[PDB]
Structures are given as structure tokens and as C-alpha cells.
Design a protein around this ligand. Structure first.
Ligand SMILES: C[N+](C)(C)CCOC(N)=O
Ligand SMILES: C[N+](C)(C)CCOC(N)=O
Lengths: 205, 205, 205, 205, 205
């Protein structure tokens, strides 16, 4: 099957509005932030302006194709795919997507989406000018799907936290840790899941 | 009836331009603001910049499905649903919607849309640096549907008004009260309902 | 008919690109600005930043329905209606529409569209800090339809000037007067009609 | 034909992607800027912020209709028409179109599109505070069509320079001249044409 | 064939979603930045604000037509073509496209798309006020297509750098060099090609 046929099939049958739930599994969404830049920081207002790649991964079996004499992967506009409705709860501006809105789809149905996002957050900026640094916590989860529908997990972070970080930022990254929680809010009786990203950073000497 | 079928049926037959009035009866729309952040304040200009979740709830029986062996709920893009034309009257900027534009639809036809919104308002900022604090009143109602078509239910869950307010804001919340008004404006003959949200807050100190 | 049928018929047959000229006569469009706020003023640059409701009224007989056993009125997305191409001539920013883009349509074909608009203007700000106040003149008319196609007249000097004006603005309204001009510019061969809105205001003391 | 029929026909058959070339002849596009305002000036950065009407005129014979017992002219959304791909070469912001995006089409096929545009430019601001004034040159031409396809031309100019200029601007207009260039650049060995608009202006006493 | 026919065929059959891969070989995309302006510079934050023409060239054989008695070239909206998903890696704002979104298509299938872009970057601004100048490096490559699907090379180095640059900028260009890189990052198993553009510039003085 060629690239054109795969993308035709996906465009014609994909249901961007349908969570690709399988029987009674939640859709396992993995989330991992790779920080590229820290552009503006305010210790007084506890506000931070930040650029990061939001590595998002999940499975959608309906996109799958037989890769016998066919490409293993294609790039697909996200408007033709179901995409998890992730939001950053402590964000104070809408995500400015810097990169083309294309996801990578593998023949088995895996979807890799990695937009570069600039976004401002309300978090702990105290101690940014210290050796210990500030620890800014960014919380990301599904806005409308609870835990029986979307689970979110971090990945494993044994590649350099500064691997893609800008050497020319005023700031440097001491540490990045990722944990998950199941929270129960007063609007709704079900538990919603999130990945908490801890950005320990500081102003350069 | 699986998720895909329900969302197909809703997309195909939902009449998003059509207020889901039942008989002579107004659509009962409940509104409740949960404040997340207070980002900028100006006592001189009486302007406030604020992030809140606008918890909006109503009934549309045309969305309903038999939930016998089916999901109790689905998430649906708001473009495929009728949504109340709520507006904040004392808003001085258009609502910046920070979250995915998806509503939660229950099998009996109840709809929860809970966007996170950043928006600026013109309101009483006097006494923001006092113990008593400022009391900033935000008025929300239907822009074109009068009281025989849309009623607003101003009920508040009695939890911390700071359940999800940012501990890192320069400001803190003393109190949040909600009341309902019914107002005859000179433009038109009929009364329009609103919810008045009183945000009593102050600078930390 | 019911609300759904009326809205279907309007959506299916309304011709948004078509001025609802009746016989050989101009469409009589009435325009009236109700000022809500004055947010920023600069006496040096003669610039003003202002929030107002643009009460716009006109007739479109093609939208009419028999209201015998039917609703007198419905709310309709403006994208499904012809709307006069009004522009504020001395505007220096595009109109930021703050409210839902719905117009109210009466069974006889009468339309009311009354968006809340934030917009900046170039006008006389001199004397803003005086007792006499500044007098800022805003001109509004059709951008492409001349007087044999669109007439604009003001509405009703009844409603108080400060009727909806924010008590929390730094400024107060002394007087609002509205007047129809008819003008033959040198570019074009026909008369264009406008409404001139004179906002006499000042800084509070 | 009535107005509705003419606009239906245009909408149904207009080919917005298709330059209305006749023969091997270029489409004669005339361009003329009428300055309304000069809002911000910086002599240090050589940047200017300006509001002007960009009067654009051209012929599209495919739009023509028999005007025997029919209107001479209609207003048409520019999305239903081919429009020349004009760009200001020395622009440093995208054109902010302030007015409704409607062109005027005459029964013989002439199309008059006069949007009001706010846009910033990089040009010579030196001597703005002098008697002689600054002379800011704005260059406008087709971005992708060369001279055998689009010929850009300056219109007639009995028209007064400050005919429509704001009396309330900090600045005044001494002179506005328009001339035509035909540059063959180093990449591409086909000629590209522009209209150069020279805005001689200064700060008021 | 005439212009209308060519554009119809392209619109009807172009597969904008489909990389025009020929055999298992990569689409050879050439990229070359021509700097028009440098608008704002910050040596403290290492941020730059820049206007450039992003000359992008590539082949799509599916767009080809027989040019025997037909035009050699047409202009085509990019929404009707596949376009490489290029992104500037060190950008900190989304590309503000200043120009009309049209690409030039040649009868053999060559495509030249050359938008003018304003964009901000994070790069080395140190020494901007020196004789040596600052050297700001901008990296551009495909965001989702690796090196077996997209190659990127600079266009050939006979052309010029200052030829299009604004004489009125506060800054001047000393040198522009373009080199190509192929780089495997730890996030992803495949190599991604980029073009690195080195902008050596300085403040006039
Ligand atoms: C509280 N929250 C944001 C996690 C879930 C809100 O529920 C919706 N939107 O249906
Ligand atoms: C006064 N107000 C805004 C509540 C209602 C305006 O009515 C409309 N838009 O038809």
C-alpha cells in the first residue's frame, strides 16, 4: 500500500471526535515534556513563560494498516485524528503551538504527536536566584475524560534533561522529574488523571 | 450503542442553532465560577484580569440515548451542540478559552461544559490592599435569550472557594458569593436573567 | 411551526450575501451606540479605547414566518443572515466583538443585532481633564452600500446616556448625541450615509 | 436579473484561484493609497504605524452580467472573487484589515476593493520633526505574479493628499506621490512590478 | 490547456496530505533565508525579532502538466499543495506570514514557495554592539519527516544577503552563511536534516 492510499483511508474513516477506547480499557496516553527554553520569569507574580516539546503518545487501532509492502509510518494532520484533550491546569495563556500540526502514525496504530509549545504558567518561582533554584510544577491531564477513559503516564527520563534546552537562555535546568496523580474534583464524581512535571531551574551565574 | 454510534448520532442530528426549549419552559442553565487565578489588578483603572472555570450546566433532551448497554457519558465538541449564549456584561476583553472545547454529555441529555477562561473585567477594585479586600462583581447572562427562554441558576457548591485557586497568586480569596438577578433593559421589552458573582479578594500581606 | 423549523428554514434559504432590498428602496438600518466603558484615553495621540453596544436594527422580509401558533422571535447566528456592512470610519483597530454573534429575529422580519464591541478610535480628546470635557466623535456607516441601498438613522434619545455605563470607569459621560449625515466623497459618485455619535466625556473628580 | 441572482451566479462560477487573464495580456491592477492616519512613529528604529485605504481596482470579465433591467453594481465577499496577491514589500506586520471584506463589482466586470488597513512599515523616518518632514516610501506589488500576468499601476490623482486624513493625528501630510517600478531581481529573471508610494509627512508644530 | 484548467486539475487531484515521494527516495527540499529586516534585539535575553523571505523549493511530479500550448507556470494557494512541514527549531514565536499564501508551480512540477515571515528566535546576540557583531544561528528542518523522506539543503551560494535588506534598519548584515546538518536526537531513532543559517549582524555605528 502506498503513502497516498494510507492517508486517504485515514482521512476517509478516521473519527477525530471518537476516543479510540478498546473494549473496557482506558486509552493509555503517555506525556513527557522536554524543555527547550525559559523565556521570562517573575518571582513577584509567580509567573513563568516557557517553551517545551509536549511528547504525547497513544494507541488508535482504527488507523492501523498492513505494512507488508508498505511504509512503516506516515505523517498525518491532527485534524484527521482523535487527539487526547490534554490541558495544563495551571496555565494562564493558551498553548501557542510553534510547529506544524502533524502527528506521526505507525502501521500498528501508535500515534506520536510532539508539538513545540510556548505557554505561560502560574507556579512556584521563589528561589529562582538561588543555588537550589526554583521548582515550577506543571500539571497536565485530560480536561473531560476521567480515568476509566484516559490514563496519563510519564515515560522514563534517562536522557539528559537539558538535551534540547537552549544554551543561550538566561536560565539553566538543574532537574526535571515527572509523577502522576488521580484527583477527584467537586464538579464530577470520577477520578481524573494527571502528569505533574517538576521543573527545578535557576538564573545562571 | 457504542461511543462512536452515539457521537455520530449527535453530530448528524444535533441542532446547535436551536435552543432545546421544552414546551413554554425556559432552558434552565446553571452557572458557577470557580476562580483559579487573579493575574493582574489595577486599583486606579478598576480593571481586573482573572482566570476561572465557568461551570455551565443544562439539559438538551435531543442528545439523549438509551444507556442500557452503552456508555453513560461522552465528550462532544461544543460546535456539535447548542450552547447557551452566555456573556459577561462587564467584560472588557473577549473570553480567552484556555482548554479544549469539549462538553460532557450524559445519556439523559444533561450537558456539562466547563472551560477555563482568562478574561479582563471592569469592576470595583477599591480596597484591594486592605484587610476587608476588594469586592469585584462579575455579571453573567444570556446575551439574546430573555427569561422565558433561558433562566440562570446561580447555585454554588459550598466547598472552599479556593479549592482550586492558585496558592502562588499574589492575591487570596476571602469570599465568593453568587446571586441571581432579573433585569428589564431599555433596548427590549422582556427581562433578562443573570448570575452575579461577587469575588471578595485581596493582596497577600 | 416550532423554533427548530423556523431556524432550519432561515438557515436553508437565508442569503447572507444578499441585501434585502424591498422594491427599489434602501434598506433602512438604524444604529445607536450605548457606551459601557471608556478604558484608555490619550490626549497627546488623540486616541480613545472604548466599549459600547452597537444596537443595529433593520428589516429582512425573507426571514419572516407566520407566527399564528409559533414563537414570536428566535435567536440566529449572524453567519446565517445578511448583516449591514457597517464600519466605524475613524476606527484604528478592528472591532473586538465581546459577545456571542447571534441576532434576534422577529416573525415579521425585524432583526436586532447588538454586539458589545471594544474598539479604539482617532478623535478629539482635547479637554478630557476639563469640566467641559472632551467631545469624541465616532462616525459609522456602510462601507460599500451607498444611500440608495442603505440608509442609516439613529434610534431613540430616550435611554439615558450613562444608563449602562460603568460606574467604575475613570471617566464619566456628560452627553451623547447622535445625528445622520449624508456625504458625497470624491472617490465615489454616490452619497454615503452615516451616523455621527458625539461622546462628550471627562475624567472624574 | 435581480441582486440575488447576480450574487448566486458569481458565487457558483467565480474561480478565486484563477487570475482573470484575457489573451496573453496582464491583468491591469491599479493601486492607490489614501492615508487616514499616522499613529506611531519611531525615528530611531525607522518604523511607522499607519492606517490607509488601499484602493485596488481591476477587471474580471467572468463576473459580468447583462445590466438591461438589472442593478449596475453589487457588493460581493472577496472570498467569492479572485483578488490580486498584493503585498507591501517593506511591511513588518501583517495587514490588519479594519473594514468588512466586501468588494464592489460593476456589471461590466470592474471590481473596486477598498479595505482600510492598519499596518507597520520599515521606512525613512529621518527628519520627521523638521519642516521638510520625513519621506516614508511604501512599495506594493504582486507577490507571485510577474509583469506578464499582473501589471500594477498608480491611479488618477486629482484627489487631495489629506482629503481623508485625520485632523486629530499628531502628524500632518505635506505630500503623497505615487510612481511605478519594474524590477528584475537576482533570483528570478522575470520582471516584477510595483507602485511606490512616497509619504512626505511631519510632526505638527 | 489554459490557466483555469491547470488550476482545476491541481485542486481536484492534489493530495496536500501526501509527501510527493518518488521511489523510496527523499523529497529534496531546498531552503534559503533572505533577510529583509532585524526589528528588535535583546542582548540580555538573547532574543531576536526578524523578517525574512523563506525561499523554499521542491518537486512534486503529480502537479505536472504538458506545457506545449499552455502556460509554463501558475500561482496556486498552498492549501491546494503539499508543503514541507518545515519548522525553525529555535523559534520562540509562531511564524507570522506577511504575504499572500501562494506558491508558484512550474509545468514540470517544481514548486517555489517564498513567504515573508516575521518571527522571534532564541540565539546568540552577544557582541551585537561590536565590530565583529553578533552571530545568530537559525536552524530549519522538517518537524516530522526524517532524512529518508525529506532532505534539506541550502540553495547554491552565488546569490546575495544584503540585496534585500532594509537600509533603514538600526542593524546591518556582515555575513550570512548556510550549512546543512544531519542530526539524530535521543528522542527518535531516525536522523533529521536541517539547514543552519548563520546571521552575522551588528548595530550601525
Ligand atoms: C475538573 N476537570 C477540569 C478535571 C474536569 C471537568 O469536567 C468536564 N469538563 O467535563
Ligand atoms: C440587553 N441585553 C444585552 C441583555 C439583551 C440584548 O438583546 C439582543 N441581543 O437581542
Amino acid at each position: 500500500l502506498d503513502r497516498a492510499d494510507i492517508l486517504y483511508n485515514i482521512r476517509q474513516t478516521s473519527r477525530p471526535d471518537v476516543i479510540p477506547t478498546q473494549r473496557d480499557r482506558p486509552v493509555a496516553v503517555s506525556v513527557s515534556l522536554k524543555f527547550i527554553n525559559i523565556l521570562e520569569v517573575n518571582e513577584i507574580t509567580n509567573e513563568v513563560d516557557v517553551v517545551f516539546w509536549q511528547q504525547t503518545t497513544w494507541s488508535d487501532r482504527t488507523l492501523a494498516w498492513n505494512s507488508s509492502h508498505s511504509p512503516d509510518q506516515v505523517s498525518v494532520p491532527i485534524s484527521s485524528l482523535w487527539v487526547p484533550d490534554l490541558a495544563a491546569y495551571n496555565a494562564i495563556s493558551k498553548p501557542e503551538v510553534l510547529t506544524p500540526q502533524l502527528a506521526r502514525v505507525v502501521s500498528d496504530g501508535e500515534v506520536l504527536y510532539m508539538p513545540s509549545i510556548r505557554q505561560r504558567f502560574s507556579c512556584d518561582v521563589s528561589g529562582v536566584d538561588t543555588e537550589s533554584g526554583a521548582t515550577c510544577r506543571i500539571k497536565i491531564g485530560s480536561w473531560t475524560h476521567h480515568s476509566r477513559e484516559i490514563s496519563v503516564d510519564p515515560t522514563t527520563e534517562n536522557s539528559d534533561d537539558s538535551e534540547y534546552f537552549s544554551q543561550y537562555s538566561r536560565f539553566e535546568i538543574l532537574d526535571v522529574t515527572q509523577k502522576k496523580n488521580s484527583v477527584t474534583y467537586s464538579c464530577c464524581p470520577e477520578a481524573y488523571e494527571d502528569v505533574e512535571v517538576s521543573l527545578n531551574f535557576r538564573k545562571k551565574g
